[PDB]
Amino acid sequence: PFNSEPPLTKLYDSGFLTPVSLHFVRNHGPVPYVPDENILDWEVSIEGMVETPYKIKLSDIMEQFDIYSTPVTMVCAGNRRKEQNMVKKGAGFNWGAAGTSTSLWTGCMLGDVIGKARPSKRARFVWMEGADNPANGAYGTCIRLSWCMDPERCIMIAYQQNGEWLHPDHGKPLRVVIPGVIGGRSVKWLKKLVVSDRPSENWYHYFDNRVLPTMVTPEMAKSDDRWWKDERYAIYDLNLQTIICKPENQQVIKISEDEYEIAGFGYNGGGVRIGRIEVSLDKGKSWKLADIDYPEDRYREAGYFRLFGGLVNVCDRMSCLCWCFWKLKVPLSELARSKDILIRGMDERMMVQPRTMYWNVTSMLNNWWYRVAIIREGESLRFEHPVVANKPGGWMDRVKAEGGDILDNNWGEVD
Amino acid sequence: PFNSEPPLTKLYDSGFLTPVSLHFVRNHGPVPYVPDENILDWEVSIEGMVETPYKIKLSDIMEQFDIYSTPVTMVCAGNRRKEQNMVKKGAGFNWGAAGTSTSLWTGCMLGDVIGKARPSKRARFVWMEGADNPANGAYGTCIRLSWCMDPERCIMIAYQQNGEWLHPDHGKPLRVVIPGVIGGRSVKWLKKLVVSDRPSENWYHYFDNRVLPTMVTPEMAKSDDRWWKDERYAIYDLNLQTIICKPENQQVIKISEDEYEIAGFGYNGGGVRIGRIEVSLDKGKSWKLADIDYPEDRYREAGYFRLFGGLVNVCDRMSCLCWCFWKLKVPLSELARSKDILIRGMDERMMVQPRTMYWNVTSMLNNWWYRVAIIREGESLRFEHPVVANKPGGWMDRVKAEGGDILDNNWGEVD
Numbered sequence: 001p002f003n004s005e006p007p008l009t010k011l012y013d014s015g016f017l018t019p020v021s022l023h024f025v026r027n028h029g030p031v032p033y034v035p036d037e038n039i040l041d042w043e044v045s046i047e048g049m050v051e052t053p054y055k056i057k058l059s060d061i062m063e064q065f066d067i068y069s070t071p072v073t074m075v076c077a078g079n080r081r082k083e084q085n086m087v088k089k090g091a092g093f094n095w096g097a098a099g100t101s102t103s104l105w106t107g108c109m110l111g112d113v114i115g116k117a118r119p120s121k122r123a124r125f126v127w128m129e130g131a132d133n134p135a136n137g138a139y140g141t142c143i144r145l146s147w148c149m150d151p152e153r154c155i156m157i158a159y160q161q162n163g164e165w166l167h168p169d170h171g172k173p174l175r176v177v178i179p180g181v182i183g184g185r186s187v188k189w190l191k192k193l194v195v196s197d198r199p200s201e202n203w204y205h206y207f208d209n210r211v212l213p214t215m216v217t218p219e220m221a222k223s224d225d226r227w228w229k230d231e232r233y234a235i236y237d238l239n240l241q242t243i244i245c246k247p248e249n250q251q252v253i254k255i256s257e258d259e260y261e262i263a264g265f266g267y268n269g270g271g272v273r274i275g276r277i278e279v280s281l282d283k284g285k286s287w288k289l290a291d292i293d294y295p296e297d298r299y300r301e302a303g304y305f306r307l308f309g310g311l312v313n314v315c316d317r318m319s320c321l322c323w324c325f326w327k328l329k330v331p332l333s334e335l336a337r338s339k340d341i342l343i344r345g346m347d348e349r350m351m352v353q354p355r356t357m358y359w360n361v362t363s364m365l366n367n368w369w370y371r372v373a374i375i376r377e378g379e380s381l382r383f384e385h386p387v388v389a390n391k392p393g394g395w396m397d398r399v400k401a402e403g404g405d406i407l408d409n410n411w412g413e414v415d
Numbered sequence: 416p417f418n419s420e421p422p423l424t425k426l427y428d429s430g431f432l433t434p435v436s437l438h439f440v441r442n443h444g445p446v447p448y449v450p451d452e453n454i455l456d457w458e459v460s461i462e463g464m465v466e467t468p469y470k471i472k473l474s475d476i477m478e479q480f481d482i483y484s485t486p487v488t489m490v491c492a493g494n495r496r497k498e499q500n501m502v503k504k505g506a507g508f509n510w511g512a513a514g515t516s517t518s519l520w521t522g523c524m525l526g527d528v529i530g531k532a533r534p535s536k537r538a539r540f541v542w543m544e545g546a547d548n549p550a551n552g553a554y555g556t557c558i559r560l561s562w563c564m565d566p567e568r569c570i571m572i573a574y575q576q577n578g579e580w581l582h583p584d585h586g587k588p589l590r591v592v593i594p595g596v597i598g599g600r601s602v603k604w605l606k607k608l609v610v611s612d613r614p615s616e617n618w619y620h621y622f623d624n625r626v627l628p629t630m631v632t633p634e635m636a637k638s639d640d641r642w643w644k645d646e647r648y649a650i651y652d653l654n655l656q657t658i659i660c661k662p663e664n665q666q667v668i669k670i671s672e673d674e675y676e677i678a679g680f681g682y683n684g685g686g687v688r689i690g691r692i693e694v695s696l697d698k699g700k701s702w703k704l705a706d707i708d709y710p711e712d713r714y715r716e717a718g719y720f721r722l723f724g725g726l727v728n729v730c731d732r733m734s735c736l737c738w739c740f741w742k743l744k745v746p747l748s749e750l751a752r753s754k755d756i757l758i759r760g761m762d763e764r765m766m767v768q769p770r771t772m773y774w775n776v777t778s779m780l781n782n783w784w785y786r787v788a789i790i791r792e793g794e795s796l797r798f799e800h801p802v803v804a805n806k807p808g809g810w811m812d813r814v815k816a817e818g819g820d821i822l823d824n825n826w827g828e829v830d
């Protein structure tokens with residue numbers, strides 16, 4: 001496999017729409033390389049439990065279906081994996097907190113494409129299969145049929161990203177983009193859509209992209225395949241995340257009468273808005289309400305307009321399919337009396353991020369509170385994120401050097 | 416207002432469908448009393464942003480619309496309020512854990528009723544108003560239009576409960592039943608449906624049924640009305656709850672070689688399945704996987720059939736609109752080495768119940784882990800639930816008698 005993660009500061013600083021060059025990459029195997037001259041002839045087959053199976057070329061999609069341009073936040077299931085790895089080593093690429101990127105995606109509605117084949121009333125799922133050939137054969141997975149037909153979910157088949165034709169690494173020439181759901185279901189190099197009454201039976205649907213129960217050890221999961229065949233553990237909708245980006249790791253700030261603007265981003269699954277983002281400087285004893293900016297709502301408020309030949313119709317939805325940004329000003333004098341900054345979000349289902357880590361075999365969907373340690377050094381404060389992408393230098397490295405237990409009630413820090 | 420809560424043991428023991436006589440009751444004011452002879456003439460007006468406003472009598476609903484019979488779990492937003500009251504006294508009826516009841520509801524689809532009036536493309540909400548007249552005028556609130564049109568959500572206008580004509584306390588002759596959403600939105604004695612592009616402006620929509628941010632004090636909420644006018648804090652979909660019912664409060668069990676079957680129920684909002692229910696006997700250090708029974712899935716598997724003149728079509732949905740039951744056998748010898756039983760659920764969005772209480776002004780949607788204390792007395796164990804409905808006798812009463820801080824890292828219990 002191949003994985004690349006943008007620097008957290010660069011991701012935040014780029015703002016609501018991440019440049020294509022910075023978008024994170026996750027490939028299970030070799031990328032199928034498709035030359036520009038072959039793009040328009042790329043063919044997808046629609047089959048299974050449908051009245052009228054058909055095949056369609058990209059050029060035909062572009063001419064025959066309504067075209068949309070939609071901002072969507074993509075998130076890898078493995079985001080924040082390194083934090084879990086610090087607690088107990090496991091398999092998988094050690095993502096920091098920047099395994100997410102947000103783009104305008106241009107293409108057709110998957111529901112329109114499937115609708116044309118007329119799915120059976122007994123159908124429940126749409127299987128998706130890619131043209132790639134990683135170690136265990138073609139990558140494939142699935143999504144609920146009803147979600148494809150739901151305008152609030154805006155599931156797309158995209159052929160442009162921020163108005164550019166897709167790069168090989170991002171699925172050239174065609175991929176599914178599934179908002180509010182882990183990147184694992186957004187199948188790249190799309191070849192086949194199969195309408196079914198049951199989930200995918202693809203190897204990658206079983207043995208990846210699952211949050212196994214916490215008490216299942218890696219040895220149990222290796223020795224008993226049944227752990228990977230219970231749909232209750234398959235990841236679809238994202239869980240709620242909030243990340244601190246300012247102050248930056250190892251940032252040093254002089255203590256003064258000035259306020260400092262703590263800041264970051266949040267995202268969530270299933271189109272459910274994050275209703276509140278709260279910060280604590282006293283280890284969760286009291287919480288302060290951050291100001292949230294939802295840039296997607298600006299697109300919602302603009303009504304209908306076109307970008308890259310596609311209709312922007314955020315205005316037709318109430319869902320939140322993109323990340324939001326948050327800010328909170330605090331006096332430096334208060335930070336100087338604090339040992340850490342914690343952030344947590346609660347959504348419009350009144351579900352909140354947990355205090356407690358949920359360690360699991362694939363170390364996926366790690367959404368316990370993100371913590372930035374505060375170290376006072378003379379008349380200045382220095383700040384430490386939990387982990388750094390690809391290097392030491394976070395508070396978890398320090399706590400391990402101190403002999404501490406990161407899972408204890410004080411994050412392994414002394415008293 | 417008037418509130419009544421069934422005994423927790425009786426609620427559990429009754430099983431998947433709660434008898435009408437045991438169903439919890441929540442009225443904000445006097446109940447409008449409607450004689451049997453007046454039922455069929457009861458009229459509802461459909462108005463607002465629609466092409467064709469109309470009025471319809473109950474008898475006409477019964478003859479003109481498709482009739483369904485659907486199991487739905489109802490839950491009061493105030494369930495588990497007494498637990499919060501033990502921490503810091505607040506306003507509101509002190510619910511234990513049994514402010515929930517599950518019934519077969521018979522009636523028409525709200526989406527069919529609204530669909531007939533042809534809502535404007537700009538419409539976003541359906542306001543609902545009741546015939547009652549509590550202190551601040553007619554009770555009214557709202558629900559998203561798109562949710563009314565979604566078959567997975569099965570929002571109904573019901574006139575029978577477990578096959579009986581509705582009782583006055585339960586909305587006779589007609590109410591809305593909104594699955595997966597707090598009982599507050601399931602408007603009783605329904606008189607008016609108004610299609611709008613914005614939320615309800617009813618007094619009860621603002622000043623009740625909200626989870627205000629935790630740092631907002633009762634004094635802040637009393638003095639600044641704006642806290643109650645931000646939709647991000649209005650409750651719709653339920654959050655995830657799991658409750659221990661066995662062992663019962665003050666139950667005493669002889670320590671032996673025998674296993675004991677710990678047991679209870681769970682429920683969740685938005686039709687999202689609870690994928691796992693986990694129990695800890697070691698204060699969250701390790702977790703054990705419970706067995707979950709989902710009786711709704713039996714109705715799903717039965718295909719189409721009729722109950723009380725209504726189509727049962729659970730088979731058409733994938734959503735979970737009802738509670739589930741859970742069981743876990745443990746050796747009594749292991750319980751004897753333990754100081755408590757904790758239970759928590761995680762749903763199919765990989766969102767888990769929190770360790771930390773989220774105290775709030777209305778003390779609503781309290782879903783931190785439910786804890787049963789274990790007290791060893793000679794060769795026996797005695798068990799204590801957090802609180803008892805209407806009386807002392809739980810571990811929270813005991814912890815307060817001990818001078819402890821329930822919000823501390825050990826639930827206020829010694830070391």
Ligand code: MTV
Nearest residue numbers: 024025026028076077130139183184186187188
């Ligand atoms: N055909 C195909 N092969 C893949 O390996 C494959 N991996 C995916 C995963 S697994 Mo994760 O939930 O472990 S994030 C993620 C992404 C990321 O897309 P990007 O590289 O365009 O960011 O595409 C998904 N789609 C795929 N499609």
Ligand code: MTV
Nearest residue numbers: 439440441443491492545554598599601602603
């Ligand atoms: N018209 C009307 N008046 C009410 O006071 C009223 N209260 C409700 C609340 S507020 Mo809560 O989220 O504070 S639970 C709940 C229920 C309960 O219905 P039941 O009495 O049939 O159990 O109906 C809701 N519907 C109502 N409808």
Ligand code: NA
Nearest residue numbers: 275347348647
């Ligand atoms: Na909220």
Ligand code: NA
Nearest residue numbers: 232690762763
């Ligand atoms: Na789950």
